[PDB]
Write an enzyme that holds these catalytic residues in place. Structure first.
Site, PDB file in Angstrom:
ATOM      1  N   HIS A 185      -0.437   4.659  16.267  1.00  0.00           N
ATOM      2  CA  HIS A 185       0.597   3.390  15.828  1.00  0.00           C
ATOM      3  C   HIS A 185       1.951   3.995  16.451  1.00  0.00           C
ATOM      4  O   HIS A 185       2.037   5.179  16.548  1.00  0.00           O
ATOM      5  CB  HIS A 185       0.657   4.224  14.548  1.00  0.00           C
ATOM      6  CG  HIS A 185      -0.932   4.006  13.581  1.00  0.00           C
ATOM      7  ND1 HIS A 185      -0.446   2.556  13.357  1.00  0.00           N
ATOM      8  CD2 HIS A 185      -1.633   4.469  12.839  1.00  0.00           C
ATOM      9  CE1 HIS A 185      -1.890   2.146  11.881  1.00  0.00           C
ATOM     10  NE2 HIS A 185      -2.362   3.693  12.371  1.00  0.00           N
TER      11      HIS A 185
ATOM     12  N   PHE B  51       1.738  10.429   1.565  1.00  0.00           N
ATOM     13  CA  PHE B  51       1.573   9.732   2.782  1.00  0.00           C
ATOM     14  C   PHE B  51       2.350   9.290   3.505  1.00  0.00           C
ATOM     15  O   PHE B  51       2.880   9.411   4.318  1.00  0.00           O
ATOM     16  CB  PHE B  51      -0.535   9.395   3.090  1.00  0.00           C
ATOM     17  CG  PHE B  51      -0.993   9.061   4.285  1.00  0.00           C
ATOM     18  CD1 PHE B  51      -0.810   9.041   5.462  1.00  0.00           C
ATOM     19  CD2 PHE B  51      -2.606   7.993   3.908  1.00  0.00           C
ATOM     20  CE1 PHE B  51      -0.997   8.640   6.331  1.00  0.00           C
ATOM     21  CE2 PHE B  51      -2.684   7.418   4.940  1.00  0.00           C
ATOM     22  CZ  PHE B  51      -1.935   8.281   6.230  1.00  0.00           C
TER      23      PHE B  51
ATOM     24  N   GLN C  44       3.369   1.299   2.622  1.00  0.00           N
ATOM     25  CA  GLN C  44       3.167   0.487   3.344  1.00  0.00           C
ATOM     26  C   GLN C  44       3.618  -1.240   3.257  1.00  0.00           C
ATOM     27  O   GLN C  44       3.305  -1.022   2.361  1.00  0.00           O
ATOM     28  CB  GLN C  44       2.013   0.630   4.402  1.00  0.00           C
ATOM     29  CG  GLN C  44       1.600  -0.747   5.312  1.00  0.00           C
ATOM     30  CD  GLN C  44      -0.278  -0.210   5.469  1.00  0.00           C
ATOM     31  OE1 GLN C  44      -0.689   0.257   5.123  1.00  0.00           O
ATOM     32  NE2 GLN C  44      -0.509  -1.678   6.213  1.00  0.00           N
TER      33      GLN C  44
ATOM     34  N   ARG D 185       0.614  -1.238  -0.539  1.00  0.00           N
ATOM     35  CA  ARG D 185       0.179   0.057   0.227  1.00  0.00           C
ATOM     36  C   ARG D 185       0.852   1.105   0.208  1.00  0.00           C
ATOM     37  O   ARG D 185       1.831   1.427   0.880  1.00  0.00           O
ATOM     38  CB  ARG D 185      -0.970  -0.365   1.011  1.00  0.00           C
ATOM     39  CG  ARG D 185      -1.814   0.883   0.772  1.00  0.00           C
ATOM     40  CD  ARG D 185      -2.738   0.748   2.704  1.00  0.00           C
ATOM     41  NE  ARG D 185      -3.719  -0.321   2.244  1.00  0.00           N
ATOM     42  CZ  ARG D 185      -3.567  -1.317   2.620  1.00  0.00           C
ATOM     43  NH1 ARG D 185      -2.597  -1.203   4.286  1.00  0.00           N
ATOM     44  NH2 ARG D 185      -4.661  -2.364   2.785  1.00  0.00           N
TER      45      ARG D 185
ATOM     46  N   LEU E 129      -1.815  10.418  13.132  1.00  0.00           N
ATOM     47  CA  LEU E 129      -1.693   8.647  13.184  1.00  0.00           C
ATOM     48  C   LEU E 129      -1.205   8.724  15.016  1.00  0.00           C
ATOM     49  O   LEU E 129      -0.765   7.503  15.447  1.00  0.00           O
ATOM     50  CB  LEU E 129      -0.703   8.097  12.500  1.00  0.00           C
ATOM     51  CG  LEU E 129      -1.335   8.186  11.238  1.00  0.00           C
ATOM     52  CD1 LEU E 129      -0.589   8.009  10.128  1.00  0.00           C
ATOM     53  CD2 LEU E 129      -2.140   7.039  11.011  1.00  0.00           C
TER      54      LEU E 129
ATOM     55  N   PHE F  82       5.182   1.201   8.275  1.00  0.00           N
ATOM     56  CA  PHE F  82       5.036   2.359   7.092  1.00  0.00           C
ATOM     57  C   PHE F  82       6.270   3.111   7.405  1.00  0.00           C
ATOM     58  O   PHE F  82       6.536   3.535   8.843  1.00  0.00           O
ATOM     59  CB  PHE F  82       3.974   2.828   6.795  1.00  0.00           C
ATOM     60  CG  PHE F  82       2.921   3.393   8.393  1.00  0.00           C
ATOM     61  CD1 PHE F  82       2.024   2.470   9.313  1.00  0.00           C
ATOM     62  CD2 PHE F  82       3.339   5.183   8.154  1.00  0.00           C
ATOM     63  CE1 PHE F  82       1.728   3.394  10.715  1.00  0.00           C
ATOM     64  CE2 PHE F  82       1.835   5.451   9.635  1.00  0.00           C
ATOM     65  CZ  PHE F  82       2.098   4.188  10.566  1.00  0.00           C
TER      66      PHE F  82
ATOM     67  N   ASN G 287      -1.477  -1.278  12.214  1.00  0.00           N
ATOM     68  CA  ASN G 287      -1.681  -2.198  13.033  1.00  0.00           C
ATOM     69  C   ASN G 287      -3.284  -2.235  12.365  1.00  0.00           C
ATOM     70  O   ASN G 287      -4.268  -1.982  11.628  1.00  0.00           O
ATOM     71  CB  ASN G 287      -2.128  -1.949  14.527  1.00  0.00           C
ATOM     72  CG  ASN G 287      -2.559  -0.684  14.969  1.00  0.00           C
ATOM     73  OD1 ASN G 287      -3.385  -0.380  14.701  1.00  0.00           O
ATOM     74  ND2 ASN G 287      -1.850   0.326  15.214  1.00  0.00           N
TER      75      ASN G 287
END
Ligand SMILES: CO[C@@H]1CC/C=C/c2cccc(c2)[C@@H](C)OC(=O)[C@@H]2CCCN(N2)C(=O)[C@H](C)NC(=O)[C@H](C(C)C)NC(=O)[C@@H]1C
Length: 164
Positions: free
Chosen positions: A125, A59, A62, A54, A121, A112, A101
């Site tokens: 995370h 951004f 991942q 991903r 986030l 990531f 997660n």
């Protein structure tokens, strides 16, 4: 004294370059150790040959699913999942290395790399490292992602291990 690990990245077989990471074992030792050991493969399994499944430009990138290679898998060196160790470190800017997660206390192997400050986030995370060298390689990987994260070519950890 913090460990340094590396990924050699390839785009469907074409070498892109090496990314290295400082792992903040001084702040999150359990989380750092998991990533270190998965990067060396010294427990008998790990990141070598897994992909960045991903990738969302602007951004993050991942990866870390070496068990299923479909974005749903992964396991830690402790068992299938382990706790959120602490949230001392924040998603402050590009290069931040953080655990993916499926909710609180479900860390496995997926991770990531941020390509921007991602403060929303924070507290969800666990941040545990940062890109040391090769941020340009991470920026290059972005061109192969898309707004919904689907990648246009398979971005592979061709090799990985520990430098220091
Ligand atoms: C297939 O898996 C599913 C779906 C998970 C995510 C889907 C998804 C799709 C498009 C865009 C985004 C997320 C944007 C908003 O967010 C990220 O990219 C975030 C960014 C931080 C890292 N990250 N993904 C994550 O940590 C995400 C939420 N979680 C997962 O990927 C876990 C893994 C670790 C088993 N999977 C799960 O919880 C499920 C079983």
């Amino acid at each position: 004294v913090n460990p340094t690990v590396f990924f050699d990245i390839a785009v469907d077989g074409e070498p892109l370059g090496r990314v290295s990471f400082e792992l903040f074992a001084d702040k999150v030792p359990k989380t750092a150790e998991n990533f270190r050991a998965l990067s060396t493969g010294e427990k008998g399994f790990g990141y070598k040959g897994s992909c960045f499944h991903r990738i969302i430009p602007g951004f993050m990138c991942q990866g870390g699913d070496f068990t299923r290679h479909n974005g749903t898998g992964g396991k830690s060196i402790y068992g299938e999942k382990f706790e959120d160790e602490n949230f001392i470190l924040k998603h402050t800017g590009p290069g931040i290395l953080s655990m993916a997660n499926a909710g609180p206390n479900t860390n496995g192997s997926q991770f990531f790399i941020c390509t921007a400050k991602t403060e929303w986030l924070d507290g969800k995370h666990v941040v545990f490292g940062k890109v040391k060298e090769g941020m340009n390689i991470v920026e290059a990987m972005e061109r192969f992602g898309s707004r919904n994260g689907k990648t246009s070519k398979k971005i592979t950890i061709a090799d990985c291990g520990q430098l220091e």
